[PDB]
Every structure is written in structure tokens, then in C-alpha cells.
Design a protein around this ligand. Structure first.
Ligand SMILES: [Cl-]
Ligand SMILES: [Cl-]
Ligand SMILES: [Cl-]
Ligand SMILES: [Cl-]
Lengths: 151, 186, 146, 146, 151, 186, 186, 186
């Protein structure tokens, strides 16, 4: 019957949902293994500060930056951390290239309309609002702690 | 200067509020072909569509946000988007946030010992800009379902977003400067 | 008949407007969550002012590296959501540009003269801004030395 | 019938062999031109050892950032020619992959199971290497403490 | 008659020769303007060391890294330098995307053969040899200067 | 903070082990059309397929891991994948590694002198997560080789992987802290 | 090293100015098939086209910058491009900027007290290079709108741009050095 | 240690030289269908093609690098590539460079005060690897003008490149260590 317009989350169409789930799982596993191989050894520490800054939060940030082809301010320096980074880089290259090719196949001339990216705009604005809320919550908690210490 | 910064923030807040309230109020958002009774060049806004030529010039009609069709192929997403567009909840939310930010600026002027009010005004202005962005995206998406043009009412709202972001930046700067002064005196 | 700015064809004009608005909003929110709290001031723990936030957002969108990266939770949320937006938008633009160009002959300078003009105009504007700031600083120093 | 490693189809096997050989040669030459001269030593003026040179070359090929960049003339010649090689090869691979995949259905997990297996095997190898080095260091420290 | 084998330098085919010449000219101009706006002002200096490291050589390196979508260890910090960087980034994005799309059109399945990239391999090996020669020449010059100073 | 961290680690390890064991044991991995007689809606796991509704509701038939006829051996890689799926060595390995990590946690609780037991538990949990990932990929790939759905047994394994990785992070943190405390004493 | 740098700068400035002037004056920018009567091989520059060989060898005909008929004003952008190409304002501007940079260098030679003259010469040379780039792009774009080739007049302008940019770098270096020497004295 | 480093470098240099000289010498580079007299499975190298089955088994024939064809469509690039392949100048150049690097390493033992010999050997080994890369690319490109396979002779040369790069790295390391020791005493 009537033509179905593109979905709001239509940017996920080129890859199957199982691929997305396994991508999330691989991201989590890569971040955990990177943090483990970077921080577990007592001989990489020095009250005591680590030689590298690859904690779990920083490992997750590094993996997310690598997957998005952006990069961050830190890079692994040990052999095992560099092995993790290299395999993650190869995985990212293959997956992103496949996604771009399949997106080119799927978008089928006519210019792309805002209805095709309204979902990514919604996600962006929601993320900005969440970040603002988190920052305000942290500020309120710190101010309350300061007031409690004062009184 | 602190006085110049305060004056600029107040003037920008008033300008953004006036531009947004004009954009929501007037009906020159879109210049598209159509009808104004029950295929000519008409002008439409968030609520009304009016013809600008012919024997029906100057006649306005309320927008049919839910046209009387079969409606047995539409899903819930289309109804949700159409309801959001018809309510125009995000432009009005942006207007309300801008008004509350201006009220916060005035109250802080009356409550100069209280510094969280400046931060609240900055947050209100940033949120108003974000709400404006969401409303613009919703309006453009709802118009998707062949030459059309946007009028000055649409661009008045677009200018309100940029000003609100700029006024929001200035308000956060004053909050930073005010707390730096307190540390200097400690 | 392709225009001078035919490289903007793959995306609609509304998409470009919303991209500019999203860039502005993301930069403003990043600066706010990085610098608003007096508890990360000492001098700030980060160099994420409004100017640096705009630079970071432009570098992220343009697939280019940055000298800084957010370290807090909220700044990283902003950066990650901006990275996701950038990846989707740039991939879609590249796919649409391939579709537009594959409608075989080598690309001609007539199709990129617009980007060349924009680049040269930007170079001229940057030189003018540098000269203006140099003149202002020289006048200030001359006034000071008196 | 696509294989488990079907993502290697766009390029011939000879191309992959020559890519590996080129990577090795570029890394070795970069280390040589960075570290051979006694006149840039003191401690070296740069951190471009053989291990770091291999890391830099891999990061450049994989479209990923690096913590270091060559500063001398010859190191920068190596880096620039490697960047040109990488740009051409990666663009060609992406074009050929677009040709291969478009021969519309969403990509299935069966087409990327090979890259998933490679990633997990690399994670296991890295964990094993870290454990081996930890065991060796612990044995050395135990011997020292006696 | 007989099918012609793909050119040794066939990677330049997607863009016209005039486009390549203007790309080289734009690269030179961007590097020169970046160095000028970064280093000309006496108020950006301090015997005296500059606040930034954007000399002519470093400006050329930055522009080349930006065009190759690689990045370097430095980034402009002033308003004028950042304008140059931004316009160069936009130019690079447009040009590289157009080149990739036209290369996809031009390469026309069958896997890419080594005969299609033998030219880039030749260029790489020639560049490595040139770098080795330059490094050896510099070492010989420095050693000769040291010997002359000694005697 | 050792008590709270240890309690969280042991609770999470037990939860992940139980989720993986239930997922392996149960037969609600996939919903698909088929038969359970030696094309109705059926639910299947790793070993058996059972139909729903109709006269044959609740009848379970063991999964045949060798499709087609004549026991074709055209591709060695496909045969190896089918053998891996039939054995399901990776979910079982994940269960075993989770159990060994729990045993290491208990032994470290009893000993409190050898810090390498905490590290061993963390390594076991991380390896269990990796084995879970491999098993999920193998299962989906074998299933691919008509709309279907994944049941709570499939998501029990998915939730098990996440908890195992989170517990593995917590175990490594305890190992890091334990070596920190020795550094302060020395 | 002031003398050597100054000599290199003035020699390069003069060479770039001469190359640009010759390129603008001469008519060997492009080789293409055509006629020079008011389809033989012809050589053309910015103003006139002349044929080669045959009875009409050496006859030069002025370039008609308005093709087609009836003086069609279809696209304003195309008309503006044609007007810019016909005026050739950018190569002439490049020549003028090169001459003004040379004049600045000559004036700085006599004064030796005002360091802003060196900076002015550098800015003039960089602007001349940018104008050369714009002129090259405009000329190629107008030519595009059947094998053809570029003559030595085209490459005289190309070599002029490179020398102008290199001289502009040298001039800025002299300006940087001059302010360094004042810093050491103070 | 220095002794093990020297022994490893000497052994690797000899191994790379022997592997390369075997690769250039033997004729098991390619396993492709063809003829060995004047369409069967044959084995070919850099110079000779020999059948390995049928009534013509064990018969070798020199490779026709310039087959007697019309040769009125070929350009100069094809002739250049064919001449480079026929001469096999790059494999022999790699062999010569490896031999010279080995001689430099051997001669450094008798001239232990001369440290530039180690650097020369390292440069020779790196250049030999680069020459090997060029020769491999040339051979594969020349074979391009349908199943074919590479024999152990081809992979013997490939292994020589990797060893030569590794031995080249070790030689540069000794040069760095030798000069670091000289300044340690001073
Ligand atoms: Cl209205
Ligand atoms: Cl089961
Ligand atoms: Cl002329
Ligand atoms: Cl042979």
C-alpha cells in the first residue's frame, strides 16, 4: 500500500541486530582486557601511581575512540596492550568499512532528507541533556558535601 | 567588564525571548503551495495556513494536523510525531525556559549574594536552545509528509537559538568569574 | 547542471542547518559541563573553554585529531555522543556523494572550484584577522611605552 | 559461498603479502633513520625505536592516531610516503569492498565471524603474553630477594 | 585491439591532472599562510623561543598530515591559525571523499591485483631509499664537521 | 572497603555462574517454526527442540546437528563449525571458568596470604566472558547456516557475560589494592 | 646573514614578477583546435588566439569571451565567472601585488629602521600567490565550460606562484629575525 | 650480550644469503599450467620452466621472456617491465647486497676499532631487503601477463627478506651500542 518512510533509527539497518550486540560485547571485552593487561602487574606501579593511565574508565574511552575512528590523548605502550589495540584497530577497520558499504547499498539521485537523520539528532540532544544532568548532580553532591563539612 | 557582561546578557535574553515568542505566534513559517479553504501559494505557521494571492487572499485556516484519511496503515510512531508537532510542545518549552532564565537573571540582580541563580539562568538558556533544536527538527520532519521556502518566522526561531546559546555562554562565564572572586578574597 | 557548490548536493539544506546548530549546541554544552563547576578550578583542571570546545567539536566532525580530549564523565558523554553523530553523518554523506558522482570520467576542476574558493577565502580571512590583532597589540604596546 | 575470512576478498593474496612486507620494511627504515646517528643521542632525541616504529606504522596504516610523530627530515619522508601508500591502499580496499558487498539485505554475523575470532584470539594472546612477562618478573624478583 | 593493462600510476586516474596541480598549490599556500599567521607576530615570541612550534617545516608537516587524514603531534591554538586549519580540514574532507567515490567508479566481482598498486609500492620503496640516502648524507656531513673541528 | 568489594565480587560471580548454567541447561535459546517429530512454532536451545500449542505441545525432540543428507563433507571449515556447535564446548568452558573463578575467590577468602589467587579469579572470569562471546558467535553462525526470536535463555547467557566481565574488573582492582597495601607497609 | 637573505629575496621577487608579467602578456597558455578568423591547431593565452601552420599561420584573433548566441543571461554565477575570466582581474592583481612587494623590499633597503616594511612585502607576496591560485582556477574553469595542452606561458605563472610563496616565507623570516635582534639589545 | 648479538647477526646474514641464492638458483618459483617444449602442470623459476608429469616430465626449457608475437600494440612501459623481469636485476642485486653486508660484518672483526663497518653492514642488509621487495613485486607483475601456486623457491626468497630486515635491525643496534660505550668512557 502506502510507501513506508525511512525509520528514525534507520542508521542501524545496514547491520543485523546480532552484529550490533556482538559489537557491544566485543567493545566491553576489549576494554576489560586492555585495562587488565595494563594495570594488573605490580611491577608497572610505583601513594603509588601507575606508569600508564589505562584504568578501566580510560580503557573504555580508548576503545570507544578507536571504534569511532577519532582517537584520544592516550595510547598503549606495553606489548600486550599494543596487541589488544592492534586487534581492536583491525576489527574496527573491517566493521566500519563493511558498515559504510552496506549503508551505501541501503540508502537507495535524491538528496538525503532530515527525516533520515532525525533519530541521530534526537540521540545527540538526549546525550547532551544527560551530560548536563550528570554534571549538575555531581555539582550538587559536591556542594552538599562541602556544606556538611562546614557544619 | 562585569557591568557590560550583565547588560549584554540581559539584552540578549530579552532579544531571544522576543524572537522566540514572535516565531511561535506569527504564521510565516513556511511558504508552500496549498489551499486555505476546507492549490495556490499560501503561507503557514505552527497553527494557521493563509493564502497570499487570488480571491482567497488574507484568509487563514487552522492547520489540519490529523487529516481525515483512512489511517489504517499508520503506526504509533507517526501518531507520536504528529502529536508532538501539533502540540508544538518544544517551541513553547523553549519560550518558557527563556522566560525563566530571564526571571533568574532579574532575581540574581535582586539577590547578588546568591550565585547559583546565574548558573540556573545559564542552564535554562542552554536547555532552551536544545528545545529549539528539537522543535525545529520535529517541524521539518512533520513537513515531510515541489518547491517550498521558509519564512522569517522560521528564521526568527533559528536566530533565537543562536542568541540563547550565546547568552547561556555568557551566564556561565559570570558564574565562573563570581566564584573566582570569592576564592581571591579567601 | 552542477553548481559551484555541488559538493553540498548529497545532503539537504535543512541537514546542513541542523548540523551547524548541533555543532554549536554540542560545543556550548561541552564548555558548560567542563568549566561551570567551581570544584574543578584551582586555574582549571582542563583546557576546555568555549573556544577550545568549538575547536574540539570541529576537529571531531572533520575526522581530524585534537590536542585535547575530555576526561570527566559528562564531557566524555558529550564527546561520545558527538562522535556517534559524526560517524553516522559522515558515512551517510560519503554514501550519498558516491551515489551522486556515479550517475566513467575523471573528476574535473569545475566540480571542486567552490571548495577551492572557500579555502582561499578562509586563508584571506585568517591573514586579515592576524593582521588586525597585530595592529591592535602594536597600538596597545605603543600606548603602554609612552 | 563466502568464507569465514571473506573480508580479505577485495584484495588479492599477493597484495596482502606485499602489504606486510612493506609494513616491515617501512618500520625498519624508520627506526634506522631515527636512531642510527650518534649525533641525535645524548638518551635519544626521539622515542622512535624499532618497537615504537612498528607501532607508529601500524597506527598509520590502521587509520588510528599515534602518541609520537617523526621530527627529522628523513623520518618525515618515511612517514609521508607511508601515509600516501596507506591512503591509496585503504581507499582501494574500501572501493573494492563496496563492489564485493553490493553484488538489499543487512550484513549478517556469518560474514564477520572471522574478524570476531581474530579479535578474541588476539585478546587471548595478549593476556597470555602479559601473564608470561609477569611470571618472569616475579621469578626474577624472588631470586633477587634471596 | 588488445586490452590495455591498468596503468602503473592509475591511482591518479579518478582526479584530473589540473585537480592534482591545484591540490599541490593549495597545500603550499595553506602551509605558507599557516606559518605566517603563527610566527610573524613579535608578541607571540619571548635566545627567544616561540610560544608555538608552527615553523614552515612544521606547518608543511601539519598540512600534509591533515590532507592524508593522519594527524600529527601539533595543532594550531590561535584564532588565525585555527581558521586556516578548519578551511584546510573542510577542503581535505571534500577532496578525499570525491576521490574515494571516483576511485570506486574507476576500478570497474574480481579481486584487486598487485598490478594495480605496483606503482604505489614503487613510490614507497623509492621514498624509503631517498630517506636513507638523506640520513646517510646528514651523518657524513656531521662526522666531517666533527673531524674538521677536531683537527 | 575489602568486605564490600569481596561481597559484591562473590555475589556477582555466583550470579554469573548460575545464569550461564541455567542458559546452558534450558532450551529457550531460539523461537522458530519447525517440527518436533522423529511447521509449527517451536522453542529450541542447545540440545533439543520442542513445539508449542496443538496436539504435540510440549514434546521435545533432540536437535539434529547434521543437516542435508548423505553426511556431506564438502567444506572442512563448515564441518568444524558444525562440530563446535554440536559439542558447544565454549558455553561449557565459560561455565567451567566461572566455577573455577568462584573456587579461587573462596580459596583466597580462606587463605588471605597469597594475592595471586585474586588475580587467578580475575583471569578466569575474563576468560569466561571471552568464551561466552565465542559461544554466542558460534551459535548465531550455526543458526544462520521464517522470522525467529531469541528467548530468555539466550539473554541469560548475554547477561552472564556482562556480569562476568564486571566481576573480573572488580577482582583485578582487589589485586591492585592488595599490592598497594604491601607497598605502604614497606 | 642579512645580505645573503636579502639578495635571495630580491632576486626571487624580481624573477616571480617577471615570470607573472611574461605569462600575462604572452599567448601560449593553451594549445587547442580552433580557428583564428573573424579547426586547425591554435595557441591561445588570456586575450588572443593564433593558429599554427597552413596558410593562416601566425594570424592572431582576439578571444571572444561570450560564447553561444543572443547573449544569454541564464545563470548569474556563470555570467560572473565569464566576466571574471574576461577581465582576468586575478593574474593582474597578482602582478600588482608582486610589484608592490618588490617596492616594499626596495623601500626597506633604504630605510632599515621600520621593520613593518619587510612584513608588508611578505604579506604582498603571499597575497600574490593566492591571487595566482585563484586566477589559475578561474582560467581552467572557464576553459572547461579535442585534446588540449598547456604551454610555457601557463607554467610561467605556475612557477611564478611557487617562487612568490617561497620569497614570502623568506621575507617573514627576515621580519622575525629583525625583531629577535631588538630583543637581544633590550 | 655483545657476543650473542654478533653470533645471531652472523648466522642470520649467512641464512639470508643462502636462502636468497637458493631462490635465485632453483626453478620452483611458480606452479602453473603450461607447456615445456617449443597445457600441462609445470614448475617454473626465474629462468627455466620444467614439466612435472606426463611424457615430458623432467624436461626444462628457458623462459621466453620476449615471446614472438606481433608486438605492435605494446608500449615502452611493458618492454621496460619485461626487461627488468628477464634480467632479474633486483634478486641478484639483493644477493650482492647481502654478500657485501656479510663481508662487512666479517671484516669488522679484524677492524674492531672501525665502527662505520657495522653501520655499512646494516645499510646493506636493509637495502637488500628493499631490493627483494622490488624483485618480488616485479615478478608478480610480470606473471600477470586459471589456478597458479607459488613454490618453495618463491617463499625461500620471501624468508630471506624477513631475515635480512631482522639482521639489519641487529646491526644498527650494535652500532648504537658501540657508540654509546665510547661516550661512556669519555
Ligand atoms: Cl500559526
Ligand atoms: Cl536444549
Ligand atoms: Cl593572449
Ligand atoms: Cl630458473
Amino acid at each position: 500500500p502506502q510507501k513506508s518512510k525511512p525509520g528514525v533509527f534507520s542508521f542501524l539497518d545496514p547491520l543485523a541486530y546480532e552484529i550490533w550486540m556482538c559489537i557491544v560485547f566485543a567493545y566491553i571485552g576489549v576494554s576489560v582486557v586492555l585495562f587488565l593487561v595494563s594495570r594488573f602487574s605490580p611491577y608497572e606501579w610505583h601513594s603509588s601511581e601507575s606508569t600508564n593511565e589505562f584504568g578501566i574508565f580510560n580503557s573504555l574511552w580508548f576503545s570507544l575512540g578507536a571504534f569511532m575512528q577519532q582517537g584520544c590523548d592516550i595510547s598503549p605502550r606495553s606489548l600486550s596492550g599494543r596487541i589488544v589495540g592492534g586487534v581492536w584497530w583491525f576489527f574496527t577497520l573491517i566493521i566500519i568499512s563493511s558498515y559504510t558499504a552496506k549503508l551505501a547499498a541501503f540508502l537507495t539521485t535524491s538528496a538525503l532528507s532530515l527525516s533520515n537523520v532525525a533519530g541521530v539528532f534526537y540521540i545527540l540532544v538526549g546525550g547532551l541533556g544527560l551530560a548536563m544532568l550528570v554534571a549538575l548532580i555531581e555539582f550538587c553532591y559536591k556542594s552538599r558535601a562541602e556544606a556538611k563539612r562546614m557544619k | 567588564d562585569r557591568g557590560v557582561q550583565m547588560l549584554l546578557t540581559t539584552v540578549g535574553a530579552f532579544a531571544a525571548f522576543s524572537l522566540m515568542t514572535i516565531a511561535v505566534g506569527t504564521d510565516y513559517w513556511l511558504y508552500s503551495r496549498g489551499v486555505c479553504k476546507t492549490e495556490v501559494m499560501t503561507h503557514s505557521g505552527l497553527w494557521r495556513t493563509c493564502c497570499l494571492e487570488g480571491n482567497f487572499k488574507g484568509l487563514c485556516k487552522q492547520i489540519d494536523h490529523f487529516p481525515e484519511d483512512a489511517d489504517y496503515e499508520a503506526d504509533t510512531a507517526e501518531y507520536f510525531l504528529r502529536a508532538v508537532r501539533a502540540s508544538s510542545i518544544f517551541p513553547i518549552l523553549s519560550v518558557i525556559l527563556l522566560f525563566m532564565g530571564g526571571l533568574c537573571i532579574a532575581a540574581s540582580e535582586f539577590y547578588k549574594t546568591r550565585h547559583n541563580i546565574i548558573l540556573s539562568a545559564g542552564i535554562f538558556f542552554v536547555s532552551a536552545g536544545l528545545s529549539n533544536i528539537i522543535g525545529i527538527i520535529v517541524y521539518i520532519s512533520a513537513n515531510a509528509g515541489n518547491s517550498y521556502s521558509y519564512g522569517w518566522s522560521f528564521y526568527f526561531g533559528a536566530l533565537s537559538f543562536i542568541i540563547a546559546e550565546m547568552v547561556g555562554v555568557l551566564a556561565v562565564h559570570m558564574f565562573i568569574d563570581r566564584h573566582k572572586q570569592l576564592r581571591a578574597t579567601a
